[PDB]
Every structure is written in C-alpha cells, then in structure tokens.
Point group: C5
Chain length 216, copies 5
Amino acid sequence: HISDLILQASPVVQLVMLILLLASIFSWYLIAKLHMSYKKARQDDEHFQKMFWSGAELNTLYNNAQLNSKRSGLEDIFYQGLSEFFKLKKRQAPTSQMIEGTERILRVGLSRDQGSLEYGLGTLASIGSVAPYIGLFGTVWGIMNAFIGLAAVDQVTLATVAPGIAEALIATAIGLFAAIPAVLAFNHFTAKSESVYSDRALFAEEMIALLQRQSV
Amino acid sequence: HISDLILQASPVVQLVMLILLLASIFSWYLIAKLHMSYKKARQDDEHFQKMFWSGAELNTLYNNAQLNSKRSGLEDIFYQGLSEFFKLKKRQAPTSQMIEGTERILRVGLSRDQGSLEYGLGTLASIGSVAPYIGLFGTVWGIMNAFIGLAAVDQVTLATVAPGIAEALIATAIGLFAAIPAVLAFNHFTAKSESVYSDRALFAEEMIALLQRQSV
Amino acid sequence: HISDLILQASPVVQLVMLILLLASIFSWYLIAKLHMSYKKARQDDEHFQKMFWSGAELNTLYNNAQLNSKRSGLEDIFYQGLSEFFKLKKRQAPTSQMIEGTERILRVGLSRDQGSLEYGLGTLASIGSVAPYIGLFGTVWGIMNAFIGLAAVDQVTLATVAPGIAEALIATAIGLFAAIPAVLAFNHFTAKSESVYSDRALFAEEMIALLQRQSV
Amino acid sequence: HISDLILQASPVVQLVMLILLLASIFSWYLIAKLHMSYKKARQDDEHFQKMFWSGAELNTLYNNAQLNSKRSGLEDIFYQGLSEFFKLKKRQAPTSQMIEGTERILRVGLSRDQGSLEYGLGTLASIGSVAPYIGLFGTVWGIMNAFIGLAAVDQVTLATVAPGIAEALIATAIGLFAAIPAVLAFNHFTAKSESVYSDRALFAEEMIALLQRQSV
Amino acid sequence: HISDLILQASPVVQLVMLILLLASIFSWYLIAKLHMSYKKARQDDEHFQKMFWSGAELNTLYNNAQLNSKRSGLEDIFYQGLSEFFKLKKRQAPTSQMIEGTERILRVGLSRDQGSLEYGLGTLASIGSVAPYIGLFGTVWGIMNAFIGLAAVDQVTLATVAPGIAEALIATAIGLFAAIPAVLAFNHFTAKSESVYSDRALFAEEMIALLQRQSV
C-alpha cells in the first residue's frame, strides 16, 4: 500500500523522494566499493608485511617488486621508498641523507595511497548528514500542503488532512533511511582507513630502522 | 499559490524570508565562484606538474615562469621556491641551508594560495549552519502570531489558525532550502580544497628531493 | 502587544527571558569589541608589513619601533624578535643559534597577541550554543504551566491554554534571537582570527629568511 | 503490559526494535570488555612504572622482561625499546643514533598497544550516534501507520489512533536507551584511553632521559 | 505545587528524575572544585612568574623551590626542569644536550599538571551532552504512559491525558537544567585550562631562552 502514497503526492515531495532514493542507492554502491577497496588493502598489506619480516633480504624483495607490474599498496610504497635509497647510494651521498630522502618519498607514498582507498568516504559523510534534512524539507512541504489545503474545505475532519500528513512522514522516513546506512559506513570505513594508515605508517617506521642498521 | 502566502504575512516573518532568500542567492553565487576557482586550480596544477616531470631541466622551467606575467598556483609557488634557492646559491651558502630556505618559502606559497582558493568556503559553512535556525525563528514567530491571534476570535475553528500555521512552515522550509545547498558545498569544496593542498604539498616534497640530489 | 505577554508571565519564564536578553546585549557588546580589535589589527599589520618590505633596512625599522611607546601587533612582535637577535649577536653566538633564538621569541609573540585579539570570541561560542536551549527550557516550563493549569478549569477550550502556549514560544524565539547573532560572529571572527594569525605567521617566516641571508 | 505492545506491532517497527535491543546488548558487552582491558592496563602500568623507578638498574629489569612470556603493555613497550638500544650498541653506533633509534621503536609500541586497548571504542561511538535515529525511523514509521490507518475508519476517535501512537514512542524510547549507555562509555573510555596513552608516553620520555644520561 | 507532580509519577520517570537531579548536584560540585583549582593555579603562576622575571638569579630561585615542600604548578615544573639541567651539567655534557634535556623534563611537567587541573572537566562534558537526552527518554516514557492509559478510559477528555503530559515535560525540563550549567562550565574551564597551559608553556619557552644565553 505504501507504494501507492509515493505515487500520488505533490510534485515537490516526489522530487525530494527521488533525490533521497538516489542518495540511498549511491550510498549502497559506495559502501560496496569502499568494502572491496579496504579488503584488498588489508589482504595485500598482510601478504607483503609477512614476506618482508620473513628471512629474505631487502635486495631480494626489491627485485620481485620491480618485476611485478601489479605493484599496489605497501609493495608500491616500498618500491618507491627503496628506489630513492638505491638512487641516492649510487650518488655516494651520506647515510644520514640517504635515510632522510627514503623517509620523505615513502611519506609521499603512504599519503598518495590513503587518498585512493578513501575513494567515496567523504560523499557518505554528506549523504549521511544532509539527507535527514532533505527529508525534513519534504516533510515540511507536506505538512504545509495540508494546512494550505485545509482552509479551502467546508469541514475540517481529521480524515481530510491525514492522507496529506502521511505523505509528509514518508519523506522524513526515506530521509532517515538514506542517512543511517551512510553514517554507519562513514564511521566504519573512516575507522578501517585509520587502521590501514597506521599499519602502513608503523611498517614504514620499522623499514626505516632496518635501513639505518643495515647502513652502519 | 505559495507566492501569495509569502506576500501576505507578518512583517517579521517576511524579513526572515528575505534574510534567507538572500542567503540562498549568495550561497549560489559563492558555489559558482568556488567551482570556477577549484577547476582553474586543478587544470593548471596538472599542466605544470606534467611539464615539470617532463624531460626539461629546472633551469629551463624557471626561465619560462619568470617570462610569464600570468604565473598562478603551482607555477608561482615554484617560481617563489627556486627564486629563493638561486638567490642563496649566489651567496655561496651551504646546500643544507639552500634546501631548508627554499622549503620554507614554498610552505609560504602553498599556504598563501590555499587561502585564495577557499575564497567564500567559510561563509557557506555559516549560511549552512545558521540558516536552518533563522528559518526556525520565523516558524516560532509564525506559530506565536497564530495563538496570540486565536484568543481574540469568538470561535477556535482549526480553519481560523491554519492560514497562520502555514506562513510559519514556509519560513522553516525556506530555512532548509538556504542551508542544504550550502552544506553540500561546504562539504564538496572543503574536500576539493584538501585535494589541491595535498596535490601541491606532495609536488613540493618531490621538487625538494630533486633539488637535494641535483645538489650532491 | 508582544511587550504585554513578557510582562504578564510565570516568574521562571521571565527569568529565562532576562538571562537571554542580557546574553543578547552582551553578545552585541562583544561583537562590537571584536570588530574594533580585528580592524585595528588588520590596519596596523598592513602599515608595518608595507614599511618592512619597503626599502628601509632592519636596523632603521628597529630604531623607530624602540622609539614608539605605542608598539602593538606585528610591530611589537618584530621588536621582541630582533631584540633577542641583537641581544645574542652581542654575546658572539653562532648564527644558527641567533636565528633559532629569534624564531622562538616571535612564536612567543604571535601567540601572546592572538590571545589578546580573540578577547571574547569564546563567550560568543557559549552564548551561541547554550542560549537556544535556555530558551527551550523556558518553552518547556511554559507548556508545562499550561497543562498543569488546564486540569483545574471546568472546560478545556483551546482559548484557555493558548495564552499560556504563546508565553512559551516567546522564550524559544528570544532564545534563537540571542544565539543567531553569536554564531554568525563566533564564525566571522574565528575566521578573521585565523587570517590575522596566518598573515603574521607568514610575515614571521619571511622575516626569518631575511635574517638568515643578511647573516651569511 | 509494555511487553504486550512490542509483541503486537507492524513488522518494520519490530525489526527497528530488534536492531536496537541488539545494539543495546552489544553496547553492554563492549562496555564490559573495555572496562576489563583498561583496568588490566592501569594495574600493570603502575606495577612496572613503580618497579622501573625502584632502585634496580635497566639491565636487571630487561633480564626479567626477556624471561616473562606474559609481557604486556609498558613492560613489552620497554622490552621492544631497549631491545633496539642493545641491538644498536653491539653495532658500535653513535649514542645520538642509539637514542633516536630506541625512541622510534617505542613510539611504534605506544601506538601499536593503544590500538589494542581501544578494541570496541569506535563501535560505541556509532551505536551511540546512529541508534537514536534508528529509533526515530521506527517512531516515524509508527506515526505513519496510524494516519494511513486513520483514513479507513468510520470515526476518528483519539482512542482509534492512540494504540498506534504508543508503538511509535516505544521505538524512540528503545532508541534513546541503546544510545545513552554508549555515549557515557565512548566518553568514559575515550578519557581512560588518553590517560593511559599520556601515562605511557610520559614514561617513555622519562625512560629516554635515563638512557641519554647513562650514555654520557 | 510542582513538587507534588515529581512525587506522584511512574517509577521509570522518577528514576530518570533522580539520575538527573544527581547529575545536577554533581555538576555543581565539580564546577566548585574546577573553580578553586583554576584560581589557585592562576594566582601561584602570577606569583612565581613575577618573582622569576624579578632581578633574583636562577640559582637563588632554585634554592627557595628546593626548600619549599608546598611546590605546586609552575614552581614544581621549574624545579623539575632545572633539577635536570643541574644534574646534567655535573656530568659535563654539551650545552646543546643540557638544554634539550631540561626542555623534555618540563614538557613532562606542563603535561603532568594540566591533567591535574582539568580534574572533572570531562565529566561536565558528559553530564552536559547526555543529560538532555536522559530527560528526553523520561519525556517519551511519560507521553507513552499517557496514550497507553488513554485507550482504557470511557472518555478521552484532554483533562484525562494532561496530568500525564505534564509529568513528561517535567523530566525534559530537569534534563535541560542538569545540562545547561555543565555546558557553560565545560566551556568556561576548557577555556581557563588552555589559558593556563599557554601561560605556562610560554613561560617554559622564555625560561629555556634564559638558560641558552646564560650558557654561552
């Protein structure tokens, strides 16, 4: 029956209800994209991180990464890091400089891949914050195309207004239904984003340490 | 018909409705200015960034920038950066100092052009936050020039109050309509602003690296 | 007529309405003080900043500042900065130290004059945040000295309650009227405060640069 | 009697009420886990911190920690710290480096154990923020399966709607009851988390100081 | 008369009203403790700060502090600072190190006494944020032990419900009355806390400067 009400409403409330059902649908597409992105990230980070803290030397690891054309996440942040370090050593620079250099070009890798994991995470924040109040605008337009209507009729039976009051609440309900899934995913992926940054940041620190020692 | 109601209302609610329709109109002007500013920024950043990471040497690039009187964005941040570096080298200073110097005067370029991209972005935050509650003040004044009125009449027909209740909801609706476009643009341009800062910041880091190597 | 209602209300709602009309009046006094403070700041910053980047040498500028007893803003932050630098050089310290020193005692000038521009800016944040909800407390007390009253009367005519419902809405209206001017000035002066800090901070950086070069 | 209402409601409001009673129950499980985690942390920190600032030398303490397989919190952050310091000294590196090294690998211990104390603290923030508005969605669905119903009946007795209005308010009440215990524990454990970070951070600083002196 | 209503209410609303009157009372106790703590702090800071920038040498000041067993605030932060500096100099360490050392052990004094001024300041933030919504839960329980009641009676006189609607609003009023004094003191003491940190931080910077000069 609810389907019927949405079909037979003021043009304005109907546009609010499309703006919001599209926000709902886009929310859900982003929540699928962000979930895939942050599962690939977590998986490849564990794979590389394991292999790096496995016996095989830095040089060995660097060889493989250079060979792979599918370098992604930590593996690419590592390749870009050591690429700098090897490129400097060849120019017989001081260790102090070599480390400082390699530590700049992998803060310029852990920040240029955070940006590409958090693809839609800001949109979900908007959808989540605005959408409730797009709904509310629909509600107010609805309650205000009752009372504007009520004046005209001979008799103010509650039954006169009520069909119009419903078509208001529908819009605020749709508003809350667009907004809730998108503030339980701007919350869950903002968390997963800080986890992955921290995991990779602490791996970067621990890789630096290795290089300083392997130097002296 | 709605037009009619706004025309025939209490002086106070009418002033709330002008304060808000002007906020709406100014929001929209800022949302056009910010959109132009951040598209020129993104376009010129890609152009320069491409050309810099193209084969041509630093000196070549510096020549062109000095020639151009339309220096804007990264190109001006670069000119001001290297201008410092060339100005120091001529005073036979230590490399360490030369880099530190050039790295200060282009943190004093990526921060004195962020401020000029984000022209109106703070206004949109105000319009977006306050305007809902300017509307609400209109609503309350409206519901309170019903009930104050209701007392006077012989008979409290719902039909008596309803024309006055509408002219309240209109103000809260206009309030939400000023405020929604300006919290979907204090959200979208705050994002585009952090993108452009990060893009230019990471370009600054990568330019520093080049200079350190080209030194030793 | 509205004046009449405020005069003839429950003692509690009347105290809410004084607490709020005083917040309104104090808001407005602070919004005048903050506006004067941040216009003098912006004016003197441009004057000094112009004169400094004018031809005249550091020593010349330092002379004048020492002479003036009305040293304020950048001019005092500069005097305190160079005063350190001159005081060190006389103790034949290393350039490196001289700069580091002068750069500490003018981060201890750009932070001990930010605090004195932002005189009342935190109060406006309170007035702006609380005052809506002081009003709401008045509203609830009002709606709750209707219904508590309604029980007593022989006949529940809407006309019985309505004079009491109004005197509630008045309090929430006054609440919104205290709070709106003080969240469009905790927004506008927080902005002007960050502008002046940034302007003076970037001037401090550019003054440091001069001193480092004038050293070597 | 309340039990009866929840049993006899629209399928949708019933699902809102399960989503929320589960959030309530999970909140409470997390509030128990976080309380155990932060009491063990506070207890072991005091034990170690006491013993460290007790007479016994660093070497003595390091011996014991290496022996213990139950190393947790400060004791493990200390073992990982000194392990670096001892590992460097053996490679006859400069004191300056030894300290810098040991100070990196215990910022990579106070940050990889903060993450494991704050196990569920982010969930409580979600439950606390969303759950009120899941409830509200239930409320609106409820008020909107009254009015949609009201139209149908011959007579609009208040008594007709009221049984349906209740089953709405139940959902917003359950919504507030899920959300309040979880914003008085995302507040209380965010506090206890910053306490434990600060306590351990300041212990790390004071341990560094000891090592620098014991060096020279 | 109001007293009567609170006495004759549903067990649940009565528990909400005790939870909130206790929050009110605890708020007020904390607002007294925080006010004493931050007046002693401000007073002793001015006393010491005056005496330090008075003629008497560092050594003189250090003597007195060592003598006093009532060392508190800046005076203790200073004693702990110089205690480090004197303890290093005796171990004939380089000036550079002596300053760095003394500057670490008084960032580990301005942060271990901020924590002890801000005793209850976080509680006031909770009371202030939650308490409104504890009240609202009481309100909803109240409006929902009207309508659940309304069904039963033969006749739905407004006069039937109204005694029950009041006992709801009382709870939201008490809710706002717990919460307002505690967001005008989590605002006023968060401010006074940042003032005292800044005052002491800038004193620490200015003390460091003295030591560096008195060294060379």
